[PDB]
Design goal:
Two copies of one chain form a homodimer. The first copy, chain A, is an alpha/beta fold and 212 residues long. Chain A is built from seven helices and nine strands. The first copy, chain A, has a single domain (2-155), classed as 3-Layer(aba) Sandwich (Alpha/beta knot), CATH 3.40.1280.10. The complex binds 1,3-benzothiazol-6-amine (2 copies). Residues 84-86, 110-112, 114, 138-139, 141-142, 145 of chain B line the site of one 1,3-benzothiazol-6-amine (JAE). Chain A: Its EC number is 2.1.1.228.
Chain lengths: 212, 214
Amino acid sequence: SMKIDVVTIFPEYLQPVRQSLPGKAIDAGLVDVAVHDLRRWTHDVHKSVDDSPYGGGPGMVMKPTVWGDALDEICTSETLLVVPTPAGYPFTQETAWQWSTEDHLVIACGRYEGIDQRVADDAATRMRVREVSIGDYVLNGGEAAALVIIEAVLRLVPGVLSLLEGPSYTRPPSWRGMDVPPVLLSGDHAKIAAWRAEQSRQRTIERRPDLL
Amino acid sequence: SMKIDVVTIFPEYLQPVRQSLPGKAIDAGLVDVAVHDLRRWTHDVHKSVDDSPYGGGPGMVMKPTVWGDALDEICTSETLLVVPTPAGYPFTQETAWQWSTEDHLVIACGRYEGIDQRVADDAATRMRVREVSIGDYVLNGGEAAALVIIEAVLRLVPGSLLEGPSYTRPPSWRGMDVPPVLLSGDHAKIAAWRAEQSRQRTIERRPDLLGFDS
Ligand SMILES: Nc1ccc2ncsc2c1
Ligand SMILES: Nc1ccc2ncsc2c1
């Protein structure tokens, strides 16, 4: 089984991924995704989750006292705490494979300038913590990144959900003046494999020369 | 002022676009986001959108006919057609800036093995097409990538290095103190400390950004 807890000030953001879980996987106890409103752990009548940054500058920083309480309740010694942030280590397919065998992921979704660093520092003294970035761009908060991480990980858990791949084709054989490459209809499967390899090579050269 | 159309066989999955800043972006009327069910452009009663690949292989490829009809209706020659795929050019902050001044983005969300290549080829004869990857991982489809792209672009619409650690009150918490320089009120020293933290975090987490091996 894998349990995923997501903590966010926008719990509705995560509701469609919850529903996208096949019933057969839930009934089999293979997966459970739970979403938690961070404001459940606020201390004041205004339900404050952020405050101005020490050292000045623009934006707001999320409060350590609120996050500390939330993680204290939700995390255990076995938890892998995932913190999506544009300042993180890169989240890659290798990461997704590694995390796919975890028993318990907690994903802490921050907003804007981030979560007070002492939250991660404190958590790391009693569980594993991973701050990660899903790409070289900035979003307004961690929620969309959490969706990407949840999907990339869970599709690698049985029954739950190099070079670039080249182009794919299906019927009809001719469409708006363009024919499917005849080699694909040749029945020469060694040649097809070689053709696909060359298409992959060319596409990787053009789009992702970093991979070579 | 921007229009974003998303085409998908799971329109329900795009409802998170109504949350947070993208929700606020539409609430203020700076952007209009519309989500379209691809099955709307099917003509059989099974509403089939995919078929086995030519040349063999696992999985299913989305049919060009259904996609062609959808894009015929939704796109114009001014449209930027965006196709999220793990095989795309990288989507980066620079891309987000570039697309932030577009009048019309159409995001085509494929499933699994993807969309027949002729859809992009055909569209490219009348509009600009960009196949892009949001990162080096594989999803089951383009929907979550669409949400990422929309959020990254919308926050830039009018209207390098890694950021280091941030702190806020209280100055001591569970016996952990905010770095003293941040409490010192010395802007020059704080600027210098933050610059150093940024470069230090970048070397550790993203050495590629500074031209070092990963
Ligand atoms: N706090 C925060 C801000 C931006 C962002 N972008 C991707 S994850 C994340 C998290
Ligand atoms: N068709 C497809 C499959 C996977 C995927 N991952 C990110 S975008 C995308 C699109």
